[PDB]
Amino acid sequence: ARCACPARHLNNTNGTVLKLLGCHYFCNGTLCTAPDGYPCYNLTAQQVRTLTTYPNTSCAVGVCMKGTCVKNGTMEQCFKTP
Amino acid sequence: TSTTCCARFINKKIPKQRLESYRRTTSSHCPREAVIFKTKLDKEICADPTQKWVQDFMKHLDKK
């Protein structure tokens, strides 16, 4: 219930669905985990430090499983949009 | 292209008496199609727009 709330996702230039950064989000005063199977981006600490409004790194696509973004091999040009 | 998306949906129907007139549709690019409503307690709630309760409320909000 409390975790049915909107959260900021990352976009890409690849023409694919938006994806969560990691598998966790905070909304409605609650720390939440995305459902298993949820499309996500698994970024390295260094990649996160440089994450901006335009693509500047190859982003690891993944699938959320028990709060972990399991990388699937696919890479995308991800970016954030405020 | 808005990047706000709903990862989970409210499981049950919410009585209209409990909802405000707020409503935003999320991008078609979101992993899961959702409409965002707000409760009178100001909680944003993600709703599955393929459930009829949601369709009924969206209509009710246009007729207002």
Residue numbers in the entry:
A (entry chain A): 22 to 103
B (entry chain B): 7 to 70
Task: Cite, word for word, the article reporting this structure.
Evasins are chemokine-binding proteins from tick saliva, whose application as anti-inflammatory therapeutics will require manipulation of their chemokine target selectivity. Here we describe subclass A3 evasins, which are unique to the tick genus Amblyomma and distinguished from “classical” class A1 evasins by an additional disulfide bond near the chemokine recognition interface. The A3 evasin EVA-AAM1001 (EVA-A) bound to CC chemokines and inhibited their receptor activation. Structures of chemokine-bound EVA-A revealed a deep hydrophobic pocket, unique to A3 evasins, that interacts with the residue immediately following the CC motif of the chemokine.
To verify the contribution of the CC + 1 residue to affinity, we mutated this residue to Ala in CCL7, CCL11 and CCL16. Moreover, CCL7(Y13A) and CCL11(F11A) exhibited substantially increased affinity (~10,000 and ~200 fold, respectively), suggesting that the interactions of the aromatic CC + 1 residues in these chemokines had imposed an energetic penalty that was relieved by mutation to Ala. The complex of EVA-A with CCL7(Y13A) is isostructural with the wild type CCL7 complex, except in the immediate vicinity of the mutation, indicating that the affinity increase can, indeed, be attributed to changes in side chain interactions. Thus, we conclude that the preference of EVA-A for CCL16 over CCL7 and CCL11 is because the aromatic residues in the latter two chemokines are energetically disfavoured, a phenomenon known as negative selection. Here, we found that the preference of EVA-A for chemokines with aliphatic CC + 1 residues results from negative selection against some chemokines with aromatic CC + 1 residues.
